[model samples]
Target: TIPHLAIDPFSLDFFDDPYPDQQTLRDAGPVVYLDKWNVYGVARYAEVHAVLNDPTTFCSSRGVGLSDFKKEKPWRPPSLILEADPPAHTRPRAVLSKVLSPATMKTIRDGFAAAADAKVDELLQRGCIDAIADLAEAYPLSVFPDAMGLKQEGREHLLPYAGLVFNAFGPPNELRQTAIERSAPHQAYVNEQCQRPNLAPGGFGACIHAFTDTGEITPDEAPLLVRSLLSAGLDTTVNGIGAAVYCLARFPGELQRLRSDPTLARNAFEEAVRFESPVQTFFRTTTREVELGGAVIGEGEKVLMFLGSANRDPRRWSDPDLYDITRKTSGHVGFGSGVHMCVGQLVARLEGEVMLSALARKVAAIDIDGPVKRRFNNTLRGLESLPVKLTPA
Candidate 1:
């Protein structure tokens, strides 16, 4: 039997603080039903991992958003990678994996490192800055658009577009509705940017385009694949870095650990991901009758996986709530797991590694100088403003 709870997870109250509700979701049962949204909720680590790994059983082709593509007309075309299944999903994932892999990260790492150092140096000069604005948003926006090879003219559309992508994952609430109303020009800009001529010769977008010459993906498929990178790239890394800073601010001891040994920056970033999963929840449609947490879920039913909750599940992680940089974080689903795991994960890692390392090396402490404000979204978790005073090392 599935336990039913009347919870509107997309509400602002839930966004302000989701821990208590997430804890309730986990404690209630392995599989619970959120009647308010008329979807099943899976919060425990085991069940959420099961759903994510078995993409065939829990399909994304039906749309990863709350509204089923079968019943409702999508505002935009479905993402070839994020919203496809089986043969449709296979090759695109392969192409993207190759493009954004560890090997690729090695090539881009030095440039990112240099950019991180410069940005950190600038922040040090200001002494007081909004960590979210001056660091997280600024750093990624500065490097990623250039990395993607976009001409600097209309880059302001990127974050708003990314916000639409994330918000569209939830039900058509005010957030998604608002995004839809204002999305036309952003969509046009993104579409044009994804084309070959608009992309620079040697960036991530160009790299994806090059695969067309080898016949790995077609000319028509290339822009959409490039679209995948543009959609996933910026905001995710921005929130991730924000999470790392917020964690360090709250846990001064961990910041000291990072300061003592700057090498821990990688793990510190990873631990922050586990501590604060930015991509909070995702919807996976049940493909067929499947047994989940001892109950059989029918075909076409929407199952919402609470990723943030699963990362903090005590069954999988010891001291799951502790913001310990030394914590082993091999299996957390912050960026998700299985075939549909975020394609740009390595890029995010590279960005986090360099920036956090720069902070550890140069900034003495991340002291919150003003009130922290949370940015509200249907899918993402991050700060709107993080005013902080940076102590010089």
Candidate 2:
């Protein structure tokens, strides 16, 4: 019995490892229609890039998940930035792009790097560490609150608040229920932080409020935008750092390559990003009959762009599954390829490079002592535990 192509990839073990499945689809052609889901999927890099860039045909507003966003009962409210089309999406992206501009972000890079190094130094001093908690989660949670202008005392609510909201992008089920329940206590604090009194004048949170003040966006919508950053930024980067660490540990040769040439750390991180795709999936809906690989995708059908799969498509990459970082991944859709590509990716990379370099500089080696555990959400491809020893250099 063959697996259902129309079946939700989220539920399948193959999605846990999509390369072989992606190859089968890509070998078939650029566009593969699954009758069960009634959607068209693009599993190769070229097709993924083409569809991502061609937003006119593959509109995002209709939805950016398994279910359409335009539908009244969406899993969660769409990102004022991620879920909006054209004119609506433009403003929020503009505000954030400028707020998180390279120049501005450059100001924080050294600080973030320094902070990460200090944290790694501390973690390594302890001998053994859980990479996910001791370093990854700890680093950003320590920094983002101030950048977001939240006072340090109660900001512990950020992670769970964000994880639940991001996970809610998937269907309403036990997973969503558990996350929502876990997040209940943090709701009031998060909502309170969204207001002017709660937002500091110079942070990203403040800028969101400024957008509201300038009449660019209403106050009502302001918090949602702030929440988007708060929700999207934290866990992914937290685990992304861990994911990269795990990848490097698994590939010792790559670790030496990075230690010899620190610049390669960036490449290594991007490779992990391509390999793991911190963001598992996001949605796009067909606005017209889009044909690719000889399949006709009818209007209103949901299209899931397998960024993780395409990242490993042999048609676009050599040895699509290997962990080597030397290969050129110039057009990889890991950070996504189009207008809605993660605007904060620069911020994400800076964090990875800093934390990874710090670990590499201080620790001679890191290796897993136990089987890695994983958890799945609609958007985030994350791990539950990555226990390892950091032999401090």
Candidate 3:
């Protein structure tokens, strides 16, 4: 028989500490029925990986949240990239990927590195700082928007807008409601930023707009695609940065290793992403009947993929619980997988690498100074505060 539990991943409880229940779901079966939301779930690496890859049956077009787009109206328009299937998904994905390509990273690197150096100096002056606010949120928010060419004012709306996007992934709980209630102003600012006149010339958003001239994506699609970058990009990078700082603080040995060989910054961030799996879960709707691990699921069922669990799955990773920066983290789903693998990943990695390398060069020690606080988002994992005292190098 297929194991079904009343476990609710959407709750604040799950966000506060999710590992124990994630392990329970993994051990229960290849696919467990999470009846609380009446959705199926996969927590282990193999099954989650298979599900992400087999998007033909385990589709995303029905909506990637608890609500099925076929049956209910989304809070706003569906994301062109995040909530889309192929053909429609292909064009924008290409344009956005090209906008964030490797070569562009070279041009972006020096500015990012200089910004990181400035941020490190700022942190050193503070002496004791909350890494989440001081480093994680502050660093990316400073540079990334500038990279996107957004205007200076009204940028405070970024995270609130992102909160609405992520929370809407769950059931219509208070989290989603609060996000809805507070979203109007944020949405207005974001909508304005997506426009051509509002974005700076030659910015990433402008780059997407340029695609309209090439006939890759429509003029109508240009802003939405820029919206995709705005919506999908910021929160993940902020959390990834937070996770890396948190990981290095907790695992002093890894931090020491990073200091010894500053080149490890890339690997350190990758390991932190795999370790924290900041984008915790996303639901995929099953398009047709499918059998897995002896449990059969009917068409139109929702399957929540616990990506965080998959990152730490013992079946896939050796010493899965260990936070070793030197270990290879190639195949992790922290950035997701298959056709929809996060297009924002390269930029996120660059941000993480440059910032961590700066920390390695400028900060001698990262000491956790007080009880850390966690931010409860329905779909993202990150700290609200991480008070840390830094010893300057």
Candidate 4:
């Protein structure tokens, strides 16, 4: 039996800001049953970690969203990687992983770095800008789609599609409904971009289809792999870039540290992930009888790993809520954990570092001018507007 203190993990207030609720859940027990969602939750860092890593007892194959795969709806088809389990997940992941392999990332390093430098230089010259839309969304939307070989016809629609896909990972409520309505027009254009002939030669999407040619996966699975790149790849990096700016602006001393040692850029980005997990939570289901925090989770039931909450769990950190730029923070579930850990993490990191480093070199100081507004969705936590005053000296 779960503690009486456990609260619904999907409640509106929790989604808006979950710290207090998470603390309540963690204080209650490592694992608690949520009566509202009729699911168990792992709020403590250790239990959340265990639940994510123990795929044997916690299956992700039925799907991570609220609805299991057996019963489907209008949501964008699951990512070949995000929705897949081992054995099945291995092949497509292998194909894309190889393409995005370290050696391949090396090919884009100099150009990407230079691109970052240039964008920052331009933003700095402007003296003030919305860090979220101007730098965060601007940079990746500029780079990733071109790299994947998407056509210009519906290119502007990438962010909304990415937004809807992540939001759909939650319950079918007004938010999800609104996202579906928003995504309605551009789905066909996105589907058309997935066609083998629709992609240009030497593009990432075309390369994924090559796996189908080798009989690694069915031809039908190829487009989803590419669609995954489009859906998961964009807004995440956008949110990341905004968060980094938010961190440095809010914690003034940290910005100086980054300026002093550019090497800290990697750590800064990781710390930001810990501070405000870009992708908030994902679901897992029990496969057998399991005992946690004196609560018994019956076989084949649902549990949500509060990645955001777990990152801030007080039991796990000296100052669990502090965003210390110098902290030795790694092994965080910010990118997730186990096999389904985000495959595109390196790309997300690179995009983050690129823009942040650029801003650091260019802006002398950044100060927030207005209240920050958060855009709510089920899976992704993002900023609607981040107003700031930038001083370039």
Candidate 5:
């Protein structure tokens, strides 16, 4: 029999601070049945890792969310890559893989580093700033839109649309409904901008559309793939940068270590992601009856994988809760694991590495200046405001 827990994982209380409940869920068993949502959850590192790597059994095509698409209409057209499984998922994945490859990353790396320097210079001038609004949000918003060649006028819509998409991964609760109501216009704008004519030549969006010329994907599929970028790209990096700043601000010793060995910048970014996973939970469904942790999960049933919990699982890491930049986070589930692992992770890491490297060189220390406020979502963990004082180097 499955160990049943009645906790509401989607409740506001749960979202506010999930660690306690995460520990509870993991402690209950390897696979716990959520009475509230009638879904099974895999919170431990081993089970979660197995589920992710064996997507053949735990498929994504059923929809990587609580609401199974066969039962209900999705909020939008399913993502070409994210919501897809193999064979069909192959070409789009390959196209995006090429679009954001290390070679492609090399083209943008020096430019991103330069922008980070300029942004850090501005922060040095201010002395104190809201890291979330100023550095975290500002840095990505400044560079990424231009990389994708989005028009400046309606760029504000990107975050809201991304938020809505992440929120829809949960049950149609208050959070999901509210995000839908707020994001209608933003979603409309994103759909419009995904068109080929609206894309700038040489931008990532235009690059995705160019695959249509090679007969790799249909002309119609091109826009949705670009839509995947508009939806998945910026907000994740914004939150990732926010997490690194928050982690460093709270752990002054780690910040000093980074300053001494600036080469640790990329490792620092990866460690912070493991420390504070930006994207928390994602769902996968069983293709057929499967045994997980000695319990059978029926075909078509939803299984939630707690990426955050898996990252900090003591079974997988020594002193799992500590925020140590020197720690080896390679096996961590922060960017996820397996075939469906985050495709845009290189871009995310580059963004974080460049920005944090600039600060390590110029900023002497980062100290909290005021109350920190957290932004809650069904699938993301991030700050809404983080006030910090940056001492000059």
Candidate 6:
């Protein structure tokens, strides 16, 4: 029989500190059944990677949340891309690929780089600051909204909306309920911003809307597609930046290594992603009765992949807990694996590279000046407050 645990993975206790539970789940068996959530979990890297790659057997279209869309009404319209399967998933994927192509990102790189420099300059002036609020949150909010052509008046809604969306992926616990309550206005504003006229020309949102003219995506599908950018784009990068800053602060050796070879900015970003996965967990429903890891799963069963745990699995990585800039992190599932991997990862990487490189150029050392506060959510791992003092180079 598959090992069984009664732990509530979405509980505050689990969210506050999951490493102990992750170890238990991984050691219990290749796949464990959580009686609390009535879901199966795969914590090992090999199993998680296999499940992610074989989307046909472990599909995403039925809904990536605990509540199967086949049985429950989705809280909102399903993400045209995220909650979809192949054929139906093709157009939205193509549209996003074109909009965020290397060519388009290259054109925007100079601007993102300049913004990072300016943000770092402002941080240097402060000396002591909350890396989460001052740097991580501020950087993405400063660049991404304008990049998406959103108005400045209600930009505060972005993070809350993102938190809500991520939380909704878990069970209907207080965390999800509270997030839902707090993010109503923010969610409304995001919906309003997705309309065609509300987007600025040359921005990502407008580019997604333009796909309508090419007769690829319909007009009605345009807004929800743009919603994908708003929902996933900002929060993932913000947490990624926070993770990088936290890692460098904790591991001074890596920070200095980065300062010496600023080219490793990309490596630092990816290593942090592997060390501290920002987007942690996602659910996939089994397409049919299938056997996995010496256990059998019935059709439409929800199987959760612990991305954070997999990134740290000792089975796949040597000295998995170390924060090293030299690690060959190519196959790490930090941004995920296979077809349903994070599409906006390039944008997230660009933001991280520019900001960390800027800091490397100007800041000499970063030290934690006060208590670090962890922000607990159902699906994202990041900080609420990371107080750090930056010494100028």
lDDT of 1 at 320: 86
lDDT of each: 0.91, 0.76, 0.89, 0.78, 0.91, 0.90
RMSD of each: 0.9, 2.6, 1.0, 1.9, 0.9, 1.0
Q: Cα deviation in Å at residue 270, candidate 3?
A: 0.6
How many residue pairs of model 3 clash at the backbone? 0
**Model 2, position 186: C-alpha lDDT score:** 73
Per-residue alpha-carbon lDDT of model 1 for 1-393, expressed as tens digits?
Answer: 888888788999999989899889999999998987888999999999999999889999888889898888877788889999978999999999988889888888999999999999999998899999899999998899998999998899999999999999998799999988989999999999999999898898999999999999999899999888878899999999999999998898889989999999998999888899989999999889999999988988999999999999988888888999998888899999999988888899899999999999998787999988999889999999999998889
Clashes of 1: 0
Tell me the deviation in Å of residue 281 in model 4: 0.4
Model 1 misplacement above 4 A: none
lDDT of 3 by residue, 102-177 (tens): 9888988999999999999988998999898778999999889999999999888898888789888878889988
Q: How many backbone clashes does candidate 4 have?
A: 0
The residue ranges of model 5 lying beyond 4 angstroms of the native Cα positions read none
Query: Given candidate 4, what's the lDDT at residue 193?
Result: 84
- What lDDT tens digits, residue by residue, belong to model 6 across residues 1-393? 898988777788887888888888789899999999888999999899999998889989889989899999998889998999887888788889888988888999999999999999999999999999999999998899988988878887888889889999989898887887777687789889999989988999998888889888999999998999888999989899999999999999999999999999988999999999998889999999999898888988999998988999999999998999989999899888988888888899999999999988989999999998988889899999999999999
2 versus 4: better lDDT goes to = 4
Residue 108 in candidate 3, Cα distance off native in Å: 1.0
Better of 3 and 4 by TM-score: 3
User: What is residue 162's positional error in candidate 4, in angstroms?
Assistant: 1.4
Local error of candidate 2 at residue 49 (angstroms)? 1.2
Tens-digit lDDT track of model 4 for 1-393:
466653655556776777888788778777776766666677778888888887778888767877667556525556767777777778877877876777767777676788888777777777668888877787887778876878877887888787778878777767787888877676877788888888877667877778887788788888888887878888888888778889999988889888887777877988998888888888876678988556777877777778888888777877978888888787677888887787787788887777767766777788998888888778887788998888874
Better candidate by lDDT, 3 or 5: 5
TM-score of each: 0.98, 0.91, 0.98, 0.94, 0.98, 0.98
